[PDB]
Design a protein around this ligand. Structure first.
Ligand SMILES: [Zn+2]
Ligand SMILES: [Zn+2]
Ligand SMILES: [Zn+2]
Lengths: 81, 50, 77, 56, 145, 110, 250
């Protein structure tokens, strides 16, 4: 399930369990570009969380270079709410 | 050098292993052996700490 | 199928997409509108038409945006 | 093999034969000597060894 | 120095491991000939089980040094030791050896490794046929053009 | 062919006042050179207006066997830091690059 | 009901084929389109590419490739002659013979550098003898059972095979020209077949194939069939720029 309400300028973050993988491609490598999320899945208790685990925002969700070659990173906040 | 080499080749080498295993299977011998300590340690059994 | 909630949200997201039942009329009319939006956007096909007919850029884009409303005939039934 | 018998104890000879089947005596010789060559192959540096020669 | 460093690579801690593998990577890059092929081979066999650390910085560093060792020594022995790892199970060290194969092929040109990969695509096991396919994935991404 | 003894060429003349030429390559050394020049240039000096260069030149059908002389010729107007970075990837000196850039127009056009 | 009314709303395959402007396309998949006039205009457009075979089938895509014995894979030439393949075959046979014991031993007292990788042999394979394989152009989807398919619509007469020549009594190879087959004999005798009257037989209604021989024994061309006035049976049984590419790199 996806948020997909369109993108913004607020970076996303990763818990430490979820540390390292891309958001969709589920890679572990060659991350190129930073993730951005929507205000609605940006506010409040959802500030600085794990887009996947829900855990605390510590490490930065990133985008596997394949995902940027196919521009699957131009859709917005992909938060599994 | 060879002291090391001997004391470890006697233990490690796979050829010697195939030997020892055919010996055992000819005898049909088996080991039933599987695999704080200080409750066992201060015993009348001497055990040294190095 | 929550994928589908998102996917007919995608149909609601991108005017011009399709699904397995889509009709020749919706298909070709959507491609026709897109053709118009790009004749307007690209500063040079506008000169091509402006010059092909003897009209002028205001005339050209006014026609185009009028046509944008029922470009490919009246609807299907 | 390199086993000497001093007679004929046929049961014992059968066991000992079935134990060293498939040229296992020479195979043991080869594995041991290979391992020794490898140890030298590694510690050439400390050993002042330019070359190690395994006579085929 | 380096003989003293090798017993530190077993220190199972992210910061000391990071800096140690950095220093050994410098040395193996520049010193290369000073160390012996056999040393590099043993160190290959030890890297093969850093690919299970719980921290991802370690694993990326490990893959990089497989690359450097392929540059110093030739590629063929390190590639042989990587396929045999593909035979393992548990996925996250299979996937990181498949990255490493891609990296070796990128540095030392891909014709050296493509025949061995392709030929290994014939061993009838699943995890390994999928290892071959995923490695070609990364390779064309690394190779790009 | 334009200038006397210059090798052959394709002149194309657009509908917006543009005029240009497509010019063959004689050596995989030239070819691979500019190939890498721009393959780095896209990555570290993208267009101003948001676009991607690969995708703009493959708008309708993908690119095939054409290098973007007008992206390559931008190395000049680049910045010393990046001029370095890229010409060092090429491990030639910014002199080597820029002269190999200019001369290829020299032997074909003006 | 609604389904019954629109099913009756549907038409005959002859209805379609007569209506349509291009009748080659019509199939019952189209006759079952909820818009068959569209469906058929589309399928008759230029350059478009039809659905795969196998949406009807009950078997999945290549489960039909399953049952028959299948060979594994045959390398490219320029890699067989680059001596990394043979390297790999040799290492394979070695380690399949060695006993569990020896694999553990090679991991331990390793055979370090058994075979150094060979350069310029590789780099010349991949950069000097690499060559275009056989590719299939736009449209020709691969389906299962393709190998079976009979192959037809070569109404041409000259089409001969080598097993055909052997099991018909004629020659195979460079002599497939200078060999008039045993059917060109009665072509010369009473004519070529009257549905291939647009076929000329070589040595019987066509001229001598390259360096043919006139004569009446086994191995010749015999009497090129002609009238009593001299005109052959048909045809002639005896027999009486700057393509340089513009942009190129040598
Ligand atoms: Zn991804
Ligand atoms: Zn959101
Ligand atoms: Zn998480």
């Amino acid at each position: 399930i996806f948020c997909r309400k369109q993108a913004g300028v607020a970076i996303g973050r990763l818990c430490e369990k979820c540390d390292g993988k891309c958001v969709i491609c589920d890679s572990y490598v060659r991350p190129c570009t930073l993730v951005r999320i929507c205000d609605e899945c940006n506010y409040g208790s959802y500030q600085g969380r794990c887009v996947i685990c829900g855990g605390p925002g510590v490490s930065d969700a990133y985008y596997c270079k394949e995902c940027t070659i196919q521009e699957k990173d131009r859709d917005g906040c992909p938060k599994i709410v | 050098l060879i002291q090391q080499a001997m004391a470890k080749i006697m233990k490690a080498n796979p050829a010697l292993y195939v030997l020892r295993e055919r010996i055992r299977k000819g005898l049909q011998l088996y080991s039933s052996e599987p695999t704080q300590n200080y409750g066992e340690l201060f015993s009348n059994q001497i055990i040294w700490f190095v | 199928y929550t994928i589908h909630s998102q996917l007919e949200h995608l149909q609601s997201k991108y005017i011009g997409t399709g699904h397995a039942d889509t009709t020749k009329w919706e298909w070709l009319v959507n491609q026709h509108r897109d053709s118009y939006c790009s004749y307007m956007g690209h500063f040079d096909l506008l000169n091509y038409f402006a010059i092909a007919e003897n009209e002028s850029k205001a005339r050209v884009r006014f026609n185009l945006m009028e046509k944008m409303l029922q470009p490919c005939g009246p609807p299907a039934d | 093999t390199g086993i000497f018998m001093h007679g004929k104890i046929p049961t014992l000879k059968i066991s000992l034969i079935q134990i060293f089947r498939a040229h296992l005596w020479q195979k043991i010789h080869e594995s041991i000597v290979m391992d020794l060559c490898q140890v030298f192959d590694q510690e050439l540096d400390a050993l002042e060894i330019e070359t190690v020669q395994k006579e085929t | 120095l380096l003989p003293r460093l090798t017993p530190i690579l077993k220190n199972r801690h992210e910061k000391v491991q990071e800096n140690c593998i950095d220093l050994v990577g410098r040395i193996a890059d520049r010193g290369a000939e000073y160390v012996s092929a056999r040393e590099w081979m043993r160190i290959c066999f030890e890297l093969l089980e850093l690919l299970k650390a719980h921290k991802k910085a370690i694993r990326r560093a490990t893959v990089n040094t497989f690359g450097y060792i392929a540059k110093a020594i030739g590629p063929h022995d390190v590639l042989a030791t990587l396929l045999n790892n593909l035979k393992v199970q548990e996925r996250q060290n299979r996937v990181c050896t498949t990255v490493a194969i891609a990296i070796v092929a990128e540095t030392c040109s891909p014709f050296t490794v493509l025949p061995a990969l392709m030929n290994e695509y014939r061993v009838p096991e699943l995890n390994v046929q999928n290892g071959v396919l995923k490695s070609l994935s990364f390779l064309f991404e690394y190779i790009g053009e | 062919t334009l200038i006397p003894g210059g090798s052959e060429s394709l002149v194309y003349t657009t509908l917006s006042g543009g005029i240009g030429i497509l010019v063959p390559f004689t050596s995989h050394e030239d070819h691979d050179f500019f190939q890498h020049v721009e393959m780095h240039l896209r990555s570290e000096h993208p267009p101003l207006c948001g676009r991607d260069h690969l995708s703009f030149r493959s708008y309708y059908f993908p690119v095939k066997n054409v290098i973007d002389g007008d992206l390559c010729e931008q190395f000049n107007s680049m910045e010393p830091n990046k001029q370095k970075n890229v010409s060092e990837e090429l491990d030639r000196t910014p002199p080597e690059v820029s002269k190999k850039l200019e001369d290829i127009r020299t032997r074909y056009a003006f | 009901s609604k389904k019954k009314l629109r099913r009756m709303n549907r038409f005959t395959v002859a209805e379609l084929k007569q209506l349509v402007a291009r009748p080659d396309v019509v199939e019952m998949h189209d006759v079952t389109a909820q818009d068959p006039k569209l469906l058929v205009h589309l399928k008759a457009t230029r350059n478009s590419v039809p659905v795969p075979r196998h949406w009807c089938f009950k078997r999945k895509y290549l489960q039909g490739k399953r049952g028959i014995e299948k060979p594994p894979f045959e390398l490219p030439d320029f890699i067989k002659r680059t001596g990394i393949q043979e390297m790999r075959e040799a290492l394979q046979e070695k380690e399949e013979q060695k006993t569990m014991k020896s694999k553990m031993r090679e991991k331990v007292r390793p055979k370090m550098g058994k075979i150094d990788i060979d350069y310029q042999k590789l780099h010349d394979a991949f950069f000097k003898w690499q060559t275009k394989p056989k590719l299939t152009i736009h449209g020709d989807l691969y389906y299962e059972g393709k190998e079976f398919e009979t192959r037809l619509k070569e109404k041409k007469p000259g089409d001969l095979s080598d097993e055909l020549r052997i099991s018909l009594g004629m020659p195979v190879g460079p002599n497939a020209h200078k060999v008039p087959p045993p059917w060109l004999i009665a072509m010369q005798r009473y004519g070529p077949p009257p549905s291939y009257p647009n076929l000329k037989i070589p040595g019987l209604n066509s001229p001598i194939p390259e360096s043919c021989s006139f004569g009446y024994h086994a191995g010749g061309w015999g009497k090129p069939p002609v009238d009593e006035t001299g005109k052959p049976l048909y045809g002639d049984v005896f027999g009486t720029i700057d393509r340089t590419p513009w942009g190129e790199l040598e």
